[PDB]
Amino acid sequence: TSRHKVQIDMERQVQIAKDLLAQKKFLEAAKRCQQTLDSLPKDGLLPDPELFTIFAQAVYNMEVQNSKEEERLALHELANFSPANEHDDEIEDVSQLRKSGFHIYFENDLYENALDLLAQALMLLGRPTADGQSLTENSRLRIGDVYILMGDIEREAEMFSRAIHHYLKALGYYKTLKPAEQVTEKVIQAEFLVCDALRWVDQVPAKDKLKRFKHAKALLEKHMTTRPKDSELQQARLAQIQDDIDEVQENQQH
DSSP: OHHHHHHHHHHHHHHHHHHHHHTTOHHHHHHHHHHHHHHSOSSSOOOOHHHHHHHHHHHHHHHHHTOOGGGSOOGGGGGOOOOOOSOOTTSOOGGGOOOSOGGGGGSSOHHHHHHHHHHHHHHHHHOOOTTSOOOOHHHHHHHHHHHHHHHHHHHHTTOHHHHHHHHHHHHHHHTTSOOOHHHHHHHHHHHHHHHHHHTTOTTSOHHHHHHHHHHHHHHHHHHHTTOOTTHHHHHHHHHHHHHHHHHIIIIIOO
16 A cells, blocks of 8 residues: 555655654754655545654754643642543644644754644644553653653753743653663652752742652652762752752742
8 A cells, every 4th residue: 555655755754754864964854854745645544643743853862952720830730640541631632733834844943843843743742542541651751752852952941940840741651651671760860850850939928849850859869879870960960959959949939
């Protein structure tokens, strides 16, 4: 069939785009994704979410080199440490997927563009499967990864409240994952990124900042007692969290 031929071509393009991104050839990886996306048939074949995620990374990094309200942080979100529940209102229906005109993502605001491309990655990864079962381990992992990327971009774009909210969403997704060394690394990473963004958000009271910082400090301290592979990175993170506590205790609280 055509469907198989198209499928195989798309998988090769993802690998090429992936390799181009690994080589730091960002315009080239993005163009590769864009042109592949524009030429896919519009009916009966869901594109590979990697086309969107690679495209988003590519365009984000291009901007770096060239330099509803539920998406904002709610204070109560910082006091939540639960895993992500069965439903996620931010995952759009696949009916809202862009089918053509992907050249639009080279225009205007590239940060905005990258985020919209990731919204579609989420849409694709989060699509409920026909078998009626719930999202797989791989999907939930990848969704977490997407939320971290969304957060990183929003942080870079100085949207710190949106950033923190997405880092917290990523953290919730990683917590649904079967425990493992790599899962623990991502959890710890997400906790730190929350704190790093949190230092720049003006509208969270000092008291709430301090409680989250101390939570993250305790977690990282506990992790360090296991003598993990990259102890110097974790030591660096821990040192930064202490700076965050100092900053708030001395300037912001009184």
